[model samples]
Target: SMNPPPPETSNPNKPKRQTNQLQYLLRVVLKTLWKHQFAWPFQQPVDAVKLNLPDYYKIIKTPMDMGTIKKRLENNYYWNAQECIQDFNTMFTNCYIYNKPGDDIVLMAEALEKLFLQKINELPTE
Candidate 1:
């Protein structure tokens, strides 16, 4: 293959990009909550009307969880964010259950994507 990988270098001496551990852990939680708990009502209009279904009061009550991500990052011991985030991402991405965003997961996934992307931008990259 002519297009071989470029020779690796240790100029900076860290194998990969380094990030602040606190920020890293904080970002994970923020993203997870942003992706999971906070984004629900902004996307779900039907539930707001349905008697059996109830939505979070923030949108109906407190300002919604959309902007809640960064605030939670203030302090933490920092555990695995994947477990927290995966549950949410998979929950929404479940096509078999959601079938389609327009019919079901739209509001949910929309808020997820909006905040998720916001976190990704804030996070360090390779």
Candidate 2:
């Protein structure tokens, strides 16, 4: 007999609704980050010519910014919350790599990184 058990019936608990809830939490985090004071420098991609920092691209191979992340979130580019968190990590890491310690931008990056991790940890798991 070719008849078989329903594929989706194997596990009824923790359905697709969990993903929607997670997405809502991610959006909340993004909104909070966007409104933060230290978010200015990381709001958009670094302009090499305008900033006159041609070496930035050479050092930061994978540039990331909150603006790009916003678009990705709307377009459903991230499969999980960690992917968005990783982009934030990459953005901060790039800042530390190109800027000197104790610089204003570096300080902002440090503050924002701490805030990001704190908010991420607060996301509920249910």
Candidate 3:
């Protein structure tokens, strides 16, 4: 009879550390989502393609948080207004090309402006 191959040795140092770190980060993200759940409806409106509320919300809101981090930083600097405008122009240009023109576009633009203004107003005066 042929001898069986030895079992693989686990890297005891790596798995637990990586898993714990990932779990901690996931918990933080869940907490943030829970806190911001109410803002979801306004921040992310209906999508025409799927016509599903949850999917639509995720599709729209996920990108707002993910894509606009640099733009949000630019907003804080007065000198970056021109750059910000250029960024917005590029974003909307792409949106117009890919997305259908209708209430979806209108609502998204409105929500984006509203959120931006709300954030600006919330900033503490230096």
Candidate 4:
């Protein structure tokens, strides 16, 4: 912190700050997007389910899912959840991406989280 620590503040026995929940959430969402995006031409920052899964996995994966995953996994997604994070990051990375806002970082993170979780829980099977 820029300022001095209080008597009890920054105490080894005490917590420093209440984690930025939005930040944590956004990260998780990035991981989730990376895990699934590109079974064929798709990116969380840009797309969602267009064809189907399992049934389509065969085709999508062979043509795209695999290719995209190979590249992304070898590049960003594999490196540690990229584009999605960058997508979300690009917004809050600085001072003025959005012109007006009170505090929707949490809002968007929450939305991303819910969708990400939904994808996790309902992933294709068999």
Clashing pairs in 3: none
lDDT of 2 at 48: 69
Candidate 3 local lDDT, residue 35: 45
Per-model lDDT: 0.40, 0.72, 0.36, 0.33
Selected candidate, larger TM-score, 1 vs 3:
1
Q: Which ten residues in a row have the lowest lDDT in candidate 2?
A: 1-10
What residue runs in model 3 are displaced by over 4 Å at the alpha carbon? 1-66, 69-79, 103-106, 113-126
- Highest-TM-score candidate: 2
Better of 3 and 4 by TM-score: 3
Worst 10 residues of 3 by lDDT: 1-10
Write candidate 4's Cα lDDT for 1-126 as tens digits: 121121111223432221233233334433455454321223322111332223322222212222233333333332233332343333333212322354554344344445655644443231
lDDT of 1 at 123: 51
Q: What TM-score does candidate 2 get on C-alpha atoms?
A: 0.79
Judging by TM-score, tell me the better candidate of 1 and 4: 1
After aligning candidate 2 to the native by TM-score, how far in Å is the CA of 31 from where it should be?
A: 0.4
lDDT for residue 82 in candidate 1, whole number 0-100:
45
TM-score between candidate 4 and the true structure: 0.24
**Model 3 score (lDDT):** 0.36
